[PDB]
Design a protein around this ligand. Sequence first.
Ligand SMILES: CNCCCN1c2ccccc2CCc2ccccc21
Ligand SMILES: CNCCCN1c2ccccc2CCc2ccccc21
Ligand SMILES: CNCCCN1c2ccccc2CCc2ccccc21
Ligand SMILES: CNCCCN1c2ccccc2CCc2ccccc21
Ligand SMILES: [Cl-]
Lengths: 156, 152
Amino acid sequence: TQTMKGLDIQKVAGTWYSLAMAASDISLLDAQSAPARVYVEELKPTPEGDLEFLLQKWENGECAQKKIIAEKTKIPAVFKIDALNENKVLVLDTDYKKYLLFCWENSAQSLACQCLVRTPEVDDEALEKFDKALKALPMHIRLSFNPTQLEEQCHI
Amino acid sequence: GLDIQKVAGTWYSLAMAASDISLLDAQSAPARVYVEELKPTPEGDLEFLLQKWENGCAQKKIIAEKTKIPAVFKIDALNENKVLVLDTDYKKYLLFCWENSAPEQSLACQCLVRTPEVDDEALEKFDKALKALPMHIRLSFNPTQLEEQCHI
Ligand SMILES: CNCCCN1c2ccccc2CCc2ccccc21
Ligand SMILES: CNCCCN1c2ccccc2CCc2ccccc21
Ligand SMILES: CNCCCN1c2ccccc2CCc2ccccc21
Ligand SMILES: CNCCCN1c2ccccc2CCc2ccccc21
Ligand SMILES: [Cl-]
């Protein structure tokens, strides 16, 4: 999986909306509570060059929040979220101002990718770049959300 | 022009898409139905033999009655539910949609193939047909899922 060259995380800070999602396996995304059914609400880079994700997910009939710190690695658009180097964040592309494409990757191979946007509207260009970036990847499910869902907790 | 005799026989649901996530987001979801067989009738109707996952595979026959429009079939007498055949080469793939027009229109489309194998060309024709439709969920099956009927 190829990641962005020359990513500056200082330019990704702020609130985001998970516009579309895709995964290598149906059961990662299909259920409301599926393991990869996670909604990115905010990105916060640290001075150290780590990337904090503020996430929402449906559990046990309620929307829950979690902060995940993705730690910098030797590769500038690749972050680790465990000590065992099993789970990674891969940033594929961003124009900073409108959209950001990234994947969760687990190499115990599971892949769940998202198209994030800065404003809670459909961006056809962002969706097109998302689809193009996914062309090389073995995705078996894709989901996209309407503007109304983008503004509700857990995209209800 | 669609020839319903040539669409007869065994099929496999390779991929599915729908206008609404909740139509396809569980084995239990209303549009999560797998096509096993198409049978044309002498009267020019099209029988869909389906399987649906229920409490861990149940079989269902639905008759799609011919209309005055070719490749458009009605499932009920209230003209609420329709089958639209989008495209087929008879021997490899068939694309179709369930449609319902009862406050928002529902659409659920499939790519059927003649053998339980991934067909990248058929999946590409399906992807092209869906570009003009407002689909919010899409999923495709691997050869294991193709052979295991309703089980994925
Ligand atoms: C079956 N439990 C799934 C894990 C829950 N999860 C949450 C919880 C709330 C919001 C986001 C997430 C995503 C990932 C994560 C990370 C760390 C602990 C729990 C969770
Ligand atoms: C497989 N690890 C936990 C499952 C959910 N998860 C995914 C999903 C697909 C690919 C990788 C990962 C890595 C960790 C992670 C982090 C936050 C949400 C979901 C997930
Ligand atoms: C492996 N590439 C799949 C080809 C297109 N495909 C996509 C595309 C992007 C994300 C997910 C999927 C899942 C399967 C699917 C189902 C129906 C049409 C296209 C696709
Ligand atoms: C009784 N089932 C009604 C809904 C499921 N359904 C759908 C789904 C989406 C769009 C149209 C339809 C038409 C009816 C029908 C026929 C066969 C399988 C599913 C469905
Ligand atoms: Cl989608």
